[PDB]
Amino acid sequence: KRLFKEGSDVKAGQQLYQIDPATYEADYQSAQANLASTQEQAQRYKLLVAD
Amino acid sequence: QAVSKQQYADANAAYLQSKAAVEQARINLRYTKVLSPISGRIGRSAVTEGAL
């Protein structure tokens, strides 16, 4: 979408366009899933070498 | 938490079994030396060297 009227007044910080985020939103949620996983995995192993 | 209670159990389990076995081994070994139960006079030996 192109959410602004040609010739209008916009405020700095105002969304002017919207790029299809479907996949970006997807990759991001994916990434976070992974992190949440590995992070735990690590935090655990950090206490195993300790012993 | 590095190891499940189950594992530590199985572990301490075997440990006890061993300690048990050793004690039993010790006793049998000790008996390879037949001893006189009381001071006294002893006579002929019924068993004979090399016998079973």
Swiss-Prot record, chain A:
Localisation per UniProt entry: Cell inner membrane
Q: Supply the induction statement.
A: By growth under severe iron limitation.
Please summarize what the entry says happens upon disruption of the gene: Disruption of MexA, MexB and OprM significantly reduces active efflux of N-(3-oxododecanoyl) homoserine lactone/3-oxo-C12-HSL/PAI-1, but not N-butyryl homoserine lactone/C4-HSL/PAI-2.
The entry's function note states: The periplasmic linker component of the MexAB-OprM efflux system that confers multidrug resistance. Functions as the major efflux pump for n-hexane and p-xylene efflux. Has been shown in one study to be involved in the active efflux of the autoinducer N-(3-oxododecanoyl) homoserine lactone, thereby playing an indirect role in quorum-sensing; but has been shown in another study not to be involved in efflux of this autoinducer. Over-expression of the pump increases antibiotic and solvent efflux capacities. Implicated in the secretion of the siderophore pyoverdine.
Other observations noted: In both X-ray crystal structures approximately the last 100 residues are not ordered.
Q: What's this protein's family per the entry? A: Belongs to the membrane fusion protein (MFP) (TC 8.A.1) family.
User: How does the record describe its quaternary structure?
Assistant: Component of the MexAB-OprM multidrug efflux complex, composed of six MexA subunits forming a hexameric tube, binding to a MexB trimer, which interact with the trimeric OprM outer membrane channel protein. OprM is thought to not directly contact MexB; instead, MexA joins MexB and OprM by forming a funnel-like hexamer anchored to the inner membrane. MexA may initially form a hexameric ring complex with MexB prior to OprM, then OprM undergoes a conformational change as it contacts MexA, allowing the periplasmic gate to open.
> Which protein is depicted?
Multidrug resistance protein MexA
Organism the protein comes from: Pseudomonas aeruginosa (strain ATCC 15692 / DSM 22644 / CIP 104116 / JCM 14847 / LMG 12228 / 1C / PRS 101 / PAO1)
Name the gene for this chain.
mexA
Query: Intact protein stretch covered?
Result: 76 to 126 of 383
